[PDB]
Design a protein around this ligand. Structure first.
Ligand code: UPG
Ligand code: UPG
Ligand code: CL
Ligand code: MN
Ligand code: MN
Lengths: 256, 256
């Protein structure tokens, strides 16, 4: 509990909003775990200070700096910057186990039971469901694993240009091994899927614990009417939760 | 082997073409198992005779007939006709274990190793990957299970208007139980996914054992140029395999 953390990532100010909403949603649902966020120097000082309030720990990662372990890998594969920054989540050995969550996720219920899971546990990716979606995963910080991941990144890159490809390649037994490493889809519910299989969403969507705003269009790319408490024209329910947290908890926090 | 079967289903002539191509693809890849097809009286006599050549067993199911076990359920839920017909796959107790395959699937490699699997084994559905896709599944014929499925169909119907919803509801432990009941996605590769996650298809698509032509547009809805051996404007590779089998093996069979 005290050495377990939800870990997110923001490399800019737009995703910082996501991270702040995510962080707030975790607090709203009374996590007993630490909240940690990987940030980069490209995150402005005001977003950083807001992150320092919402999160227990704000970690600055500067892969553009030569002193960074991932930097050499970035020079080789400069398109892999976000991924390489994300991989620093494994560097957080002050924690024994973390749930990584993308900054464009949103928690709708307490998900501390994720810490029962082992590395690497993740929900299936829609589209290619023998890959896990790397938007939400349970992992164990380890310099060793970090180094191994960096090594694979350097050598092979990523089959999809992002962390997801690399993580699937590295944690490649996921599809065929240990059903407990399949997180229920409701722990990483693709916002695309809330219309991609409408009947299944109708059937099981009320059980959503985490919504993952895949895009294209992120929640902060919408216009939200604070009077009608709804985004302006998907079924907006989740966007509206995001915006309510953003409006209620995050914006007042930033107003300095 | 002798009492195991691939089982498909056709309720009309268009899907009969699918079934004939599927059946042919299974023979082309040298299955040691029986090939069985559920047909309805709505399947014309010429398609039926072709099916009798390709398949070891052609089973006629007429849920419109009062004598059919499913008929009462059809009267109650008449939109569930295709599903109710499909469920008769469980009535095929002359087989100890079957792989049900939709008539719009296509086999690209021998998949007899599916018979190692237990009921209910199926690949994840893209879109909502905690549901299995009912296009391809390993099951054990049983009047008992058939009756139980019919009972659930009668009582609850299907959350998606088709067999998939009902099968997921009935075989509801799939998502959380026994990784061996997750068939690799390559045993039921959604044709939608061959562009939905292009990088993953690029990475793993060459391993495709079964392509499942989800639609909208079925392989027989395309125009195929027999000179260029390609469908006229997806990546057409799989459509072209389908059409080559259709052109090479199925059409000459029907020319009576
Ligand atoms: O400019 C950026 C881009 C990404 N991120 C971080 O990296 C995560 C992933 O990027 P995101 O924009 O959320 O990507 P998605 O729209 O969720 O989709 C990508 O990321 C998913 C999970 O990481 C994969 O399933 C997809 O295939 C891939 O396209 C974000 O949530 C952030 O935490 C940033 O901080 N800044
Ligand atoms: O008029 C019909 C319709 C269906 N079938 C049979 O039933 C199967 C399922 O129908 P199909 O047209 O292939 O549906 P799909 O395009 O594959 O999609 C449906 O069926 C899938 C698996 O059964 C589910 O994953 C989807 O959610 C559902 O929309 C077919 O392959 C045939 O075997 C017929 O014989 N005649
Ligand atoms: Cl298991
Ligand atoms: Mn994301
Ligand atoms: Mn189908």
């Amino acid at each position: 509990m005290t050495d377990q953390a939800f870990v997110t990532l923001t490399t800019n100010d737009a995703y910082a909003k996501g991270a702040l909403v995510l962080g707030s949603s975790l607090k709203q649902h009374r996590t007993s775990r630490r909240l940690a966020v990987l940030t980069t120097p490209q995150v402005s000082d005001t977003m950083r200070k807001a992150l320092e309030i919402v999160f227990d720990e704000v970690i600055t990662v500067d892969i553009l700096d030569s002193g960074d372990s991932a930097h050499l890998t970035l020079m080789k594969r400069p398109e892999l910057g976000v991924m390489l920054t994300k991989l620093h989540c494994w560097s957080l050995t002050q924690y024994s186990k973390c749930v990584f969550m993308d900054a464009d996720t949103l928690v709708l219920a307490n998900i501390d039971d994720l810490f029962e899971r082992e590395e690497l546990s993740a929900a299936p990716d829609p589209g290619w469901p023998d890959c896990f979606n790397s938007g939400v995963f349970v992992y164990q910080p380890s310099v060793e694993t970090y180094n191994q991941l960096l090594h694979v990144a350097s050598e092979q890159g990523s089959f999809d240009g992002g962390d997801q490809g690399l993580l699937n390649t590295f944690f490649n037994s996921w599809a065929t091994t240990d059903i407990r490493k399949h997180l229920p889809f409701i722990y990483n519910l693709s916002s695309i899927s809330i219309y991609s299989y409408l009947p299944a969403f109708k059937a099981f969507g009320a059980n959503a614990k985490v919504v993952h705003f895949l895009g294209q269009t992120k929640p902060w790319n919408y216009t939200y009417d604070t009077k009608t408490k709804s985004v302006r024209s998907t079924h907006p329910q989740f966007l509206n939760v995001w915006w309510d947290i953003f409006t209620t908890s995050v914006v007042p926090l930033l107003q300095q």
